[PDB]
Enzyme design. Structure first.
Site, PDB file in Angstrom:
ATOM      1  N   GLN A  85     -15.005  14.977  -2.850  1.00  0.00           N
ATOM      2  CA  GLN A  85     -14.545  15.757  -1.649  1.00  0.00           C
ATOM      3  C   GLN A  85     -14.822  14.984  -0.347  1.00  0.00           C
ATOM      4  O   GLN A  85     -14.229  15.358   0.664  1.00  0.00           O
ATOM      5  CB  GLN A  85     -15.252  17.117  -1.543  1.00  0.00           C
TER       6      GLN A  85
ATOM      7  N   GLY B 163     -15.817  23.221  -8.049  1.00  0.00           N
ATOM      8  CA  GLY B 163     -15.501  22.481  -9.285  1.00  0.00           C
ATOM      9  C   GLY B 163     -14.702  21.198  -9.036  1.00  0.00           C
ATOM     10  O   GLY B 163     -13.944  20.796  -9.964  1.00  0.00           O
ATOM     11  N   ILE B 164     -14.900  20.532  -7.900  1.00  0.00           N
ATOM     12  CA  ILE B 164     -14.194  19.254  -7.608  1.00  0.00           C
ATOM     13  C   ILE B 164     -15.117  18.193  -7.046  1.00  0.00           C
ATOM     14  O   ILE B 164     -14.795  16.996  -7.233  1.00  0.00           O
ATOM     15  CB  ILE B 164     -12.947  19.471  -6.716  1.00  0.00           C
ATOM     16  N   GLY B 165     -16.163  18.559  -6.302  1.00  0.00           N
ATOM     17  CA  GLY B 165     -16.968  17.583  -5.539  1.00  0.00           C
ATOM     18  C   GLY B 165     -18.100  17.001  -6.351  1.00  0.00           C
ATOM     19  O   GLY B 165     -17.917  15.921  -6.966  1.00  0.00           O
ATOM     20  N   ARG B 166     -19.245  17.687  -6.395  1.00  0.00           N
ATOM     21  CA  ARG B 166     -20.348  17.293  -7.321  1.00  0.00           C
ATOM     22  C   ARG B 166     -19.845  17.171  -8.771  1.00  0.00           C
ATOM     23  O   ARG B 166     -20.251  16.224  -9.493  1.00  0.00           O
ATOM     24  CB  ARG B 166     -21.501  18.295  -7.224  1.00  0.00           C
ATOM     25  N   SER B 167     -19.065  18.137  -9.232  1.00  0.00           N
ATOM     26  CA  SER B 167     -18.448  18.147 -10.581  1.00  0.00           C
ATOM     27  C   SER B 167     -17.684  16.836 -10.829  1.00  0.00           C
ATOM     28  O   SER B 167     -17.796  16.261 -11.948  1.00  0.00           O
ATOM     29  CB  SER B 167     -17.540  19.362 -10.733  1.00  0.00           C
TER      30      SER B 167
ATOM     31  N   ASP C 198     -28.427  20.629   0.494  1.00  0.00           N
ATOM     32  CA  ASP C 198     -27.452  21.572   1.117  1.00  0.00           C
ATOM     33  C   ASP C 198     -26.377  20.773   1.887  1.00  0.00           C
ATOM     34  O   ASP C 198     -25.203  21.195   1.821  1.00  0.00           O
ATOM     35  CB  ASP C 198     -28.154  22.600   2.019  1.00  0.00           C
TER      36      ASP C 198
ATOM     37  N   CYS D 241     -19.549  23.272  -9.992  1.00  0.00           N
ATOM     38  CA  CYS D 241     -20.352  23.407  -8.767  1.00  0.00           C
ATOM     39  C   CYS D 241     -19.860  24.679  -8.061  1.00  0.00           C
ATOM     40  O   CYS D 241     -19.619  25.666  -8.773  1.00  0.00           O
ATOM     41  CB  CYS D 241     -20.271  22.107  -7.969  1.00  0.00           C
TER      42      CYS D 241
END
Ligand SMILES: Oc1ccccc1CNc1nc2ccccc2[nH]1
Length: 284
Positions: free
Chosen positions: A262, A218-222, A181, A215
């Site tokens: 991110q 759609g920018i960090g984990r992705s 988290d 995610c």
């Protein structure tokens, strides 16, 4: 400079925050005018995360062609990815229309539906074989065929049917279920294992449309997923694997979607995954 040495040099100097800000400063900026039209406000999960006009995925319909999704085309690696937000209650039909129209084989999901006590994306696939989902706005049917639940991720086999033509396709759903988290995983071992399972499936291969990755924004984990894959592919292809510069690959990718990676922790985790994945590469 061998990225493993660059890594220790940044770690020992604790400069991760300073590198990350350098990337933010040099990153491309292109217009996102379609995303900001008033008719599209309920198609965007976050006001500060929009696809660029030049690289946005268009839906094949005359009414409104807009979805919060970008095509990342990596020329030298010969890989393409679609990066998208977690679907909203009113964009679940659009999401599956995109999967169909782009001929994708795989969907990669890096988040849980609920995290930190809030909904991060809609429940957009069926949880029981005998309770299929129908998307009336886009005329699609989606049925759970089988589910393989493992300790760090679940793989689901799904049938997507275009109700207009009665064509059907096998869609594989790769669901990474253990990202914490807060922060990033401590070891990249389970994330690399997951990436190798997506590769083994055929989902990333040129005989299919681009994989759909998401995610919440759609920018960090992705961003982590596509950056690690591309960097390891380039280390396989080039005469000098030490030439692969992760910061230059990330800025190339940022020409296609804003904000990929991110946080400084996500940047450090990306280095770790590539360094360790290379370890299980140079001789595996
Ligand atoms: O449409 C497809 C085309 C090719 C492969 C997979 C699918 C998905 N549907 C489906 N029904 C099944 C029933 C028994 C065993 C496997 C099954 N796969």
């Amino acid at each position: 400079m061998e990225m493993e040495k660059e890594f220790e040099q940044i770690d020992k100097s604790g400069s991760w925050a300073a590198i990350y800000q350098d990337i933010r400063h040099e990153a491309s900026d292109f217009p996102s005018r379609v995303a900001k039209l008033p008719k599209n406000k309920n198609r965007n999960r976050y006001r500060d995360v929009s696809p660029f006009d030049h690289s946005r995925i268009k839906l094949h319909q005359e009414d409104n062609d807009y979805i919060n999704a970008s095509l990342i085309k990596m020329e030298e690696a010969q890989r393409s990815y679609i990066l998208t937000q977690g679907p909203l209650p009113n964009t679940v039909g659009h999401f599956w229309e995109m999967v169909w129209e782009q001929k994708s084989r795989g969907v990669v999901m890096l988040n849980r539906v609920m995290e930190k006590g809030s909904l991060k994306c809609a429940q957009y696939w069926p949880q029981k074989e005998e309770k299929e989902m129908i998307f009336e706005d886009t005329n699609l049917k989606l049925t759970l065929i089988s589910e393989d639940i493992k300790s760090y991720y679940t793989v689901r086999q799904l049938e997507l049917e275009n109700l207009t033509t009665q064509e059907t396709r096998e869609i594989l759903h790769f669901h990474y279920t253990t990202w914490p988290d807060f922060g990033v995983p401590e070891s990249p071992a389970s994330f690399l294992n997951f990436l190798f399972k997506v590769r083994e499936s055929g989902s990333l291969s040129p005989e299919h449309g681009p994989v759909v990755v998401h995610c919440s924004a759609g920018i960090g984990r992705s961003g982590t997923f596509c950056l690690a894959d591309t960097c390891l592919l380039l280390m396989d292809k080039r005469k000098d694997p030490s030439s692969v510069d992760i910061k230059k690959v990330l800025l190339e990718m940022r020409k296609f979607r804003m904000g990929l990676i991110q946080t400084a922790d996500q940047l450090r985790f990306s280095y770790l995954a590539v360094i360790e994945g290379a370890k299980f590469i140079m001789g595996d």
